[PDB]
Amino acid sequence: KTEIHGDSTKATLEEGQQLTLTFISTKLDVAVGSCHSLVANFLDGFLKFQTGSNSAFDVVEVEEPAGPAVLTIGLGHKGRLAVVLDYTRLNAALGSAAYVVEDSGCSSSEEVSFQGVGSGATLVVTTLGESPTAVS
Amino acid sequence: LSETPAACSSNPCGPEAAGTCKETNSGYICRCNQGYRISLDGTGNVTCIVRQESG
């Protein structure tokens, strides 16, 4: 395992691979070296993400995280990326969430920068998942 | 174009596990229930299974 234990880290994403980050944050912001950027607004309880240089971030509501979060990033074409966020909930539970971008407009194997990891941050590189399904 | 299924309509983040589903302008968003985490697929999509890490 790649144990970061810092404020930021950077991984190499690849089409066919995933990047998992076990970090503890309350507002982590990451950007991918091609086209991807997001802000895990854990505190406010919402997950904002954009695809491109200047773009609007969509929100996926978060069920009040406590800090512990796993952010996973996998590309399976070039622009088609999937982001998994797994957060420990303050409500005596866990909550996990994700989003996918059918065409982020990127090319295979981009450098993903995870920043705001806080502390306890640890990265693990994986290979892409299984079984396609999305709208575009 | 006839490639992708209607995200939330086809039931992606809607297994017997997941918690929430949201179609976006760039695909879809998934959200899991207490005992589940999101498992991303081999193309760049996501759905929920028992919580361990990245699914």
Domain encompassing residue A14: 1-136
Please give the method by which this entry was determined: NMR
| CA B23, chain centre distance (Å) | 10
CA gap A86, B48 in Å, rounded: 11
Domain count, chain B: 1
Q: DSSP 3-state assignment of A37? A: strand
Measured CA to CA in angstroms, residue A60 lies from A17, A36, A44 at distances of: 23, 16, 11
Q: Which residues pair with A11 in a beta bridge?
A: A112
Domain encompassing residue B34: 1-55
CATH number, domain of B28, equals 2.10.25.10
Q: Do A22 and A9 meet the contact criterion of CB atoms below 8 Å apart?
A: no
CATH number, domain of A132, equals 2.60.120.710
Chain A: residue whose CA lies nearest to B4: A135
Measured CA to CA in angstroms, residue B27 lies from A13, A51, A121, B6 at distances of: 19, 11, 28, 9
CA gap A15, A80 in Å, rounded: 9
CA gap A100, A43 in Å, rounded: 22
CA gap A84, A19 in Å, rounded: 9
Nearest to B45 among A82, A93, A104 (CB): A82
Nearest to A134 among B27, B31, B54 (CB): B27
Domain count, chain A: 1
Output the CA torsion A131→B4→A49→A91 (10° steps): -50
